[PDB]
Amino acid sequence: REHWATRLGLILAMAGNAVGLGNFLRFPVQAAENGGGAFMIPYIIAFLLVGIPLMWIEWAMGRYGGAQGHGTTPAIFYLLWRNRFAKILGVFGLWIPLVVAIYYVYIESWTLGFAIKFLVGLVPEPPTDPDSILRPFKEFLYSYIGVPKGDEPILKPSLFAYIVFLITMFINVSILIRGISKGIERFAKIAMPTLFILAVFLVIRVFLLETPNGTAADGLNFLWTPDFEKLKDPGVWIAAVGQIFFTLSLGFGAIITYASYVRKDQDIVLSGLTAATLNEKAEVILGGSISIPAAVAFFGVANAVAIAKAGAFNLGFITLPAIFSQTAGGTFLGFLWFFLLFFAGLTSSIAIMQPMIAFLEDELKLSRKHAVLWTAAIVFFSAHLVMFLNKSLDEMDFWAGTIGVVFFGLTELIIFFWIFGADKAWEEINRGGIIKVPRIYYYVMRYITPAFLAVLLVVWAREYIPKIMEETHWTVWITRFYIIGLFLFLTFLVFLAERRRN
Numbered sequence: 454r455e456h457w458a459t460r461l462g463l464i465l466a467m468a469g470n471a472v473g474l475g476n477f478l479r480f481p482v483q484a485a486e487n488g489g490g491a492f493m494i495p496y497i498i499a500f501l502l503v504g505i506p507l508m509w510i511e512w513a514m515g516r517y518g519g520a521q522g523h524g525t526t527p528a529i530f531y532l533l534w535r536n537r538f539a540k541i542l543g544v545f546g547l548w549i550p551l552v553v554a555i556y557y558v559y560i561e562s563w564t565l566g567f568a569i570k571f572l573v574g575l576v577p578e579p580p581t582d583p584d585s586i587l588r589p590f591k592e593f594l595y596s597y598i599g600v601p602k603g604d605e606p607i608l609k610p611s612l613f614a615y616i617v618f619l620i621t622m623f624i625n626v627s628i629l630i631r632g633i634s635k636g637i638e639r640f641a642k643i644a645m646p647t648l649f650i651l652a653v654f655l656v657i658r659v660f661l662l663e664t665p666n667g668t669a670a671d672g673l674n675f676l677w678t679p680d681f682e683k684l685k686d687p688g689v690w691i692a693a694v695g696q697i698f699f700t701l702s703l704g705f706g707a708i709i710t711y712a713s714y715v716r717k718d719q720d721i722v723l724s725g726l727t728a729a730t731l732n733e734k735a736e737v738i739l740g741g742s743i744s745i746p747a748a749v750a751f752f753g754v755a756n757a758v759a760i761a762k763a764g765a766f767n768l769g770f771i772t773l774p775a776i777f778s779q780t781a782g783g784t785f786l787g788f789l790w791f792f793l794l795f796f797a798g799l800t801s802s803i804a805i806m807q808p809m810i811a812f813l814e815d816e817l818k819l820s821r822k823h824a825v826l827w828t829a830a831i832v833f834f835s836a837h838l839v840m841f842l843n844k845s846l847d848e849m850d851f852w853a854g855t856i857g858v859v860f861f862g863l864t865e866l867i868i869f870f871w872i873f874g875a876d877k878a879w880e881e882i883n884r885g886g887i888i889k890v891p892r893i894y895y896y897v898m899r900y901i902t903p904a905f906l907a908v909l910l911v912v913w914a915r916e917y918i919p920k921i922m923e924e925t926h927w928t929v930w931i932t933r934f935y936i937i938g939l940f941l942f943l944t945f946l947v948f949l950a951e952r953r954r955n
């Protein structure tokens with residue numbers, strides 16, 4: 454089996470996995486919609502009672518399976534528990550990262566294209582009216598991704614966006630095709646530091662933004678000022694948990710696949726804790742100090758929150774660059790922004806394609822080259838659905854990136870810490886650890902976490918089950934049908950592997 458060359462490279466690879474578009478896009482929006490500081494408390498708690506324990510659990514499962522030559526959940530779930538249903542459940546550790554990868558890489562290609570156009574200096578040029586400043590950039594994005602005037606099911610992506618998507622796929626492939634240590638680690642050791650530097654620079658520059666309508670400091674205060682009136686709102690807790698899952702790459706089967714390349718005897722405790730901590734630092738300190746403080750700086754708090762609620766991409770791809778355009782050398786600043794976004798995305802996309810690649814390699818005994826090329830073919834092909842179909846992206850992000858990750862987290866936790874046994878699991882987690890997990894967490898993993906997740910899933914299901922059946926748009930039904938087809942396909946591949954074993 455292939456392994457990580459150094460501990461540092463491992464750390465930066467995992468941190469590259471975690472730190473991504475979720476930090477500089479999803480987080481600012483989630484926090485803004487949820488009332489700033491009010492969202493932070495539930496966010497921190499969710500980080501302690503969910504993110505950390507699940508992170509460690511996934512590292513442990515990953516390394517455990519990797520020792521036996523299995524980096525994916527279909528096989529690992531079977532090693533921990535002997536059942537066919539364990540494999541069927543394991544299929545999600547593939548389906549989820551694949552589905553997410555499909556649209557995620559497309560958004561990444563967005564960030565790349567924008568980076569290019571901002572570098573070359575082709576951008577809308579604004580003239581004191583907010584709408585006259587934002588409108589050009591809204592039209593810019595809409596022209597880029599081909600957004601319809603009314604609500605029209607069909608999207609018309611520009612040739613440039615398509616070509617840039619092809620290029621993005623090519624880059625992902627060039628990185629992934631060199632392997633774990635040569636391809637991923639090498640790139641992590643660069644992209645990560647570059648990312649941190651860019652992030653810091655942007656944070657400072659943004660902090661320097663002050664106008665008659667407000668300041669970045671106002672945004673920081675808004676974000677870090679506690680509000681206890683929202684603690685009784687379940688939605689805030691749900692959003693916080695979802696954010697924790699998404700940002701830490703929990704339930705995507707990615708952490709597990711990466712961990713399977715960690716040598717049996719190497720420490721996953723301190724490495725894992727370090728990766729998670731790095732991610733949180735990149736999220737709350739960096740991600741949260743850029744977009745929101747700037748939006749609040751120019752348009753004030755209320756308007757900033759309004760824009761945040763407006764959409765996820767509205768803050769990142771429209772508002773922020775429109776704010777930059779009003780400052781000296783704002784175009785270049787935008788470029789830095791989208792470049793940061795690009796690296797942050799790439800480091801994650803490679804991570805979510807790696808599970809599929811690893812299933813192909815380990816289970817179907819395919820060569821790395823073939824596995825990578827086929828994964829890229831599948832992802833690229835399926836991506837046309839997200840490209841040309843409006844609302845498809847949202848559906849995939851929902852079923853996979855939202856519900857699926859929580860369901861799968863609960864599943865893996867139950868399989869590892871209950872069926873496989875709690876004591877054996879604990880011993881497996883602590884084994885070889887440079888430092889040991891605090892005893893209390895044993896009780897957190899076995900009782901608190903699974904209960905919390907179960908409750909969450911119950912609430913979610915209660916709310917969504919009625920809504921699902923009544924939905925007007927056909928695009929979502931097409932997407933659902935297709936992704937279900939992907940699930941069946943993966944199940945079939947798992948079947949083939951199982952047969953090959955015999």
Ligand SMILES: C[N+](C)(C)CCOP(=O)(O)O
Pocket residue numbers: 535536537538
């Ligand atoms: C539990 N199940 C009936 C769905 C599958 C069981 O298969 P197996 O464990 O007998 O191979």
Ligand code: MET
Pocket residue numbers: 470471472473474475476553557699700701702705707801802804805
């Ligand atoms: C695309 S891998 C899962 C999401 C990633 N960890 C992020 O924060 O963006």
Ligand code: NA
Pocket residue numbers: 468469470471472473474796797798799800801802
């Ligand atoms: Na990343």
Ligand code: NA
Pocket residue numbers: 470471472473475476699700701702732
């Ligand atoms: Na993250």
